[PDB]
Amino acid sequence: RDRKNMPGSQREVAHAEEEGVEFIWQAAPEGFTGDTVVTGVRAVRIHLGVADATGRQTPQVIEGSEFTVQADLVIKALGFEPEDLPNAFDEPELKVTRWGTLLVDHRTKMTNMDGVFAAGDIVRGASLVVWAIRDGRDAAEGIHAYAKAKAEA
Amino acid sequence: CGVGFIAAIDGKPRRSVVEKGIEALKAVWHRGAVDADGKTGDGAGIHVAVPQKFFKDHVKVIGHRAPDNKLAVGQVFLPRISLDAQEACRCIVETEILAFGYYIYGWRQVPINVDIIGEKANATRPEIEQIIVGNNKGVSDEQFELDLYIIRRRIEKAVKGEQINDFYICSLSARSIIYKGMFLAEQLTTFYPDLLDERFESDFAIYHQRYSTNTFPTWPLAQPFRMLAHNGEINTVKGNVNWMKAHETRMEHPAFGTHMQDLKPVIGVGLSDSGSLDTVFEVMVRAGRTAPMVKMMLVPQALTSSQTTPDNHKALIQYCNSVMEPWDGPAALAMTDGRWVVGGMDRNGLRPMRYTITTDGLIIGGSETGMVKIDETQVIEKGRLGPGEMIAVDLQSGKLYRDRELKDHLATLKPWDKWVQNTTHLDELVKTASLKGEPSDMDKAELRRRQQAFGLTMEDMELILHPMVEDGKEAIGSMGDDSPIAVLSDKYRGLHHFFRQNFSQVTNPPIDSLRERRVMSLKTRLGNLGNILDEDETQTRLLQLESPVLTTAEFRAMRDYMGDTAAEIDATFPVDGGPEALRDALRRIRQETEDAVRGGATHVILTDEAMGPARAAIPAILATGAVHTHLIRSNLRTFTSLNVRTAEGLDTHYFAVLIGVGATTVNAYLAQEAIAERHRRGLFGSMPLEKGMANYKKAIDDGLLKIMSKMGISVISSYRGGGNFEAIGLSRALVAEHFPAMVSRISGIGLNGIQKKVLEQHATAYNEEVVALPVGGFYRFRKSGDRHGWEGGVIHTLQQAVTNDSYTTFKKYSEQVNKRPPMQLRDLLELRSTKAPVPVDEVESITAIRKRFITPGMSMGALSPEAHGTLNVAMNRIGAKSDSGEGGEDPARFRPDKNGDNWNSAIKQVASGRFGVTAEYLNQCRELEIKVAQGAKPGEGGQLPGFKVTEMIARLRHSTPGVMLISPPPHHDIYSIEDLAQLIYDLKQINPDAKVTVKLVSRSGIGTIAAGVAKANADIILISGNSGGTGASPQTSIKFAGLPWEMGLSEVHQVLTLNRLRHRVRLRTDGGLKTGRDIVIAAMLGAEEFGIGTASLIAMGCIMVRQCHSNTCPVGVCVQDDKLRQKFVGTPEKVVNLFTFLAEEVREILAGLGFRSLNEVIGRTDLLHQVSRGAEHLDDLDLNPRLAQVDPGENARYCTLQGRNEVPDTLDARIVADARPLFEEGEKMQLAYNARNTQRAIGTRLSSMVTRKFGMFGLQPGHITIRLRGTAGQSLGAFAVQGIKLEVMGDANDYVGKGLSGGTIVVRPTTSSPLETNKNTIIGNTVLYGATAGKLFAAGQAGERFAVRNSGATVVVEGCGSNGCEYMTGGTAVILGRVGDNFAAGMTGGMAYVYDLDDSLPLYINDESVIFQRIEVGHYESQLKHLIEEHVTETQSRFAAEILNDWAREVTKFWQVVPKEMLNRLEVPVHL
Amino acid sequence: KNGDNWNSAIKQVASGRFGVTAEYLNQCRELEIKVAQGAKPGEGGQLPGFKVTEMIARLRHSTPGVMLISPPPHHDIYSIEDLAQLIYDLKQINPDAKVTVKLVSRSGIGTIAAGV
Ligand SMILES: Cc1cc2nc3c(=O)[nH]c(=O)nc-3n(C[C@H](O)[C@H](O)[C@H](O)COP(=O)(O)O)c2cc1C
């Protein structure tokens, strides 16, 4: 993508540039040429048209742009995903979304099964720590209310 | 007027279809016939499917059982006046329906309410009834339809048998039902309340309303016809009926059987052209063909001679051309069988038709994209239709078929590629032609003998023949010829001189031949005619010719090719035969041809080789007429062909006259021999013989192409034997016994006079010795030939009489003009009254009459500024009305000078070119005039030589210096009567003070167009004559076109007074008005005002050189140089005294006549009497078909109504009432409104007010802005001044930005429309017609003929169509998308930027005067960058921003088109 | 030049009359009588001390650097009769426009509405 819409914050970009890192925008890797220790990275530049009627630019590849970068040690940071929870806890009734994150109600922060609640970063995705604390406080209130009710009934 | 159709894709009934159909029909009153009565209509109809459940309920109510098979309903118009006919009509229909055993279910009378139609349309109201019948044999559907059609035909014939008028059958079937009548469109659901039931549901419907040209209605003449609808008129109908009567003899098919005999007269009598097309369509589809098949056969696609189309398409085109003659002309066809629904165009795409697709699987098409109210976000496609294209809906399978899909699927029927090779061509025969047996030419003595035998002079051998064979084009004359008509002259003239050419006024438009060469073809098909219903390969085994005219060697090759199937006819008759020898010769050839055709012969060659001292040559025209009409009458023309060998064909007019009769080929061997003998004598230079021959052939072909395009037709195949001419001065009996159908107003000589003339010429040519060809007087004045109109004595007398300022010399002038031999028709008449004279000072004052004269228009290019200004000031100082002529006017001449003279004109011309019309130009006059067709050259464009346009005229017409600037032969804005009404409405909106005038040319059939244009809110019909001058025109057009103004005027008067419309207009004539007698005769005929024209030029000093088209006028009138302009001699006082003398003469003439004023002699045409020429000519000319008139009654015979007829105003008037501060203080304004498609020419009166207050460029751009929401109206923003900005959220209909002069129009789709802004039409056709300056930014695709006559506009569009940027003279046009065909036709100014994708633009460009390249100099890159930046920041488009985003490498995909005449006249040149 | 009419169309007459001159009431198509403002009824509009610069001082013929407060009453309308008198004067000084009266919703405003 472009620097203007990097999913991170801008202070990190400026600091990494100050320390001496080199940036190459609008690219995607395809191959890692090498025998046992990777020697080079075969990658291709990409193009971004204007945004759609929604606000999500569409990428495309250049048919004539191909390049190779020097490589000694490649570190992938493609992202993260949630695990497969049902078979992980021997509870195959855990209602999960297709994306891997589990479902939970909006009001009480309680999942499908009773007693068990779920809140934090596993519900949303790759959110921040402030959202984590928000969900934690909401789940704490939900647990308190539900436990008082269950002790009462 | 209008036509539209609604169809559902899936194929199931629903009430929504009929609801939307009615809603759309209820929004056409703006294009209709607005009048003063308030109730009279002009014809409206709808055509839907049969609601079986409704009639089942009805018959259940009656008392019978509810049947299973679909019922059949038939609507009939029965006589109402005499009940004694209803019984016979019921009798016939019942005895012919029960003839097969069908169970009649009953009768029914449809509810009506006659309280809503007018009164003239009610006295002709018939009785309307419906029959309900059923099926009892369990017959299939196709056989049911066949039987119903046969029953209908038999009933029609039987009713014809009893001669019972006023009987009709609307539609008789089980799938379709038609509700049509002679009421107003909107009131339809109030006339036929049956359509308000909750069961009338269908899956398709077609609606139409027609524009009545005459005011006398007739119910069965209202579309939709039986299984067809139509818009416009067909140029050639009189030529198709003959070919249909010819094909009548070889049509039969086992799908009909014995009943086929009862289908012979396929075309009845009295039905309009659309009706004939409808009937032949129904016959051709009742055999098994599908609707697209018969459509492609009837109206073929124009054969583009490029490999840019699939080959199977080309083979199908060849086949469909070979099987049936085309029916060209304006047509937006909407046909529908019981299964398919097809919409289609003509060859050229003359009339618009646009459609749209909703989300519900519903397609809605018509003439305006706003007639139906639909949600703007529930659409999926807004499409248009190009020329020859078509759209189809398959209801049996429920599928939409676009253009290419349908053409492919239809080519997937039969192997059309394998059959086009079954024919035999001609090129292979001419290349392998035997180079032996070459003929030895005659000795020069016999050649001169044979040439004198035809009265053929020698001046033609250098004036009209030498320039043709030298360069390869026709000759050009520079003054209107005023020689006497053929029947009056005594010297022998060619018989062709009695046949004038036909052309089309505003009813059907002309077509340019210098630019539209891709659409016209001159193929000829020998061995062509065959069975029209058969489907096999024996139909495409024939001979094909590239031209009808052929040389001698080619003719010998073809004759040897024909083998032993040739037949020769003697075209000579004995000199000593007797007084009636011509009748015997014609009878002999007529019986001989009919004897030879049955014997087995198949090709009749008619040659005149048998000419000798004892045998004179029969006029080949009469021979061809006789033989063709006999073969048509005897059901034999289909079996044979007809080749003719003439002996006098030298011009381009004789061949056209001969082909219009019915001949196929022509080989004038005397012309080739003369060319050869004049070449071997060494006067052309060092050019080879065959090269000159080729140039000659090409010139003849181009002349015939021009003469075919003048009428409006496109293909020669539908012109052969059409009778499209005009006969003058021949007996009715002869012209109707030996010519198919030609109008003969006045009779003339018969056969004996022609025999005498021919024998006289034969005797004076053969029996004596001639050594030298005489000069002959036919084009310019010579003493040896016949008389002329402007002789030396007459002109010198007039000049002396106007210089000495004396009246008695003018009297001598008039007496000399009068005592001349009879030369023109108006001479034969004589005034006659029963009164006694009065003192000369009892008639009206001199000024009271001088307030009626004007001068006709003259071009600023073919005259000098000095002479033009002199005429203008002379006409202004007297108090009469002057002229400005085509070519604009100098602005500095708008206000008076210190000497007290107004050097501005009074009448402005808006011609086919629109070379100077601006905001200010249309607001410096008191009258308007639409120059439809000029006097000397009908249906031709305003010609002007290239080297005459200096810097002055080039900067006055927004053109390039020194280039032949020819006006478009068509008008591009007047295609039908509704368009002319729209143009008049615009021209009256732009100037609320003046009035608009129309100029017509006298010819037969002008009465209909007169009664039509009178209802178009006009108030002056200026009838020109054929004896009027010009600037530069081909001699053939001047000599062989038009009729004297007497006939046209006496016809217009009668037709206008018959329809009670005479009291609403004014009638004015000109042409040859020289002395007072002619003026008073014209006033007697019905005219009120008068024009003089060329005579005025004689008063200025013109010496009649007739060499004005070379810029060397000796008296310095038609001069554009420097040394020649100083020779001017004229003076306005000359014109002053001329007009004063004419006024005094007419005053004295009316005084001696007896009356007191002119207002009492106008229309009293019984004061004229016809006398004879003498006791020696023995002709029978009867002008009585003019001397009759219609008794008016209450309303007078003149214009009793002062002031123009105002027009209904649109919302713009209310706009003026809101924008007061803009007129009182000068501050910006921002307005917004909701528009509909019934708001014509919005924002025009605001432009008028702005240009009246400030000026052309007195306001800063973007001063006032107006935002409209929804579909706009027609001709948006006509003539906008700088500052006004009209933004639209939606789409426009047509003529958007017409005549722009500084406005800024922006069109864009709505924000809530999920549509690609570069693949859906957002505007219509002829965008920016004749604009002058201003920016235009579109956000969609344009129609056809986009940006024509552009002069200073800067437009940005993401599309184009056929003939885009035609004749672009200046400005810029950025185009982002595929273009149509024939791009930049004849462009000579401006620059174009095209954005190709598949790199195919060189396959579509018409590289004649423009070159296309890549963008090279960075200056042009920056220019295009600026333009696209403004476009994307003004419309906020998506594709523009996309292109601009990936700008780094996308510039290599651009093509730049620049004319060739400006490669070295630019500051920054093209190439490095 | 650009055709912007920075002029107003409705002129006010407050309880202070800080700019009311002869001409200032002849450049409008409507007058105005500000009886009681919406939020703070029965009180005069204020203006802080450090906001009055030289421009507004010349506009109101006052002294810079001081807090402006108009008197709560209008000093010309002490009853309905004086209101009618002032309406007469305002209609006579401007023989072209109309007049108006601005109030504030409360109980019993119908009677004063009928009065005005
Ligand atoms: C030299 C010349 C130039 C003309 N130019 C125009 C013209 O530009 N536009 C037009 O409508 N008619 C033009 N006309 C035709 C006149 O308007 C008018 O129809 C004709 O001159 C009448 O002929 P008359 O003088 O014999 O009556 C021209 C005629 C002549 C002789």
Ligand code: F3S
């Ligand atoms: S009549 Fe015409 S041809 Fe020249 S001399 Fe006069 S302008």
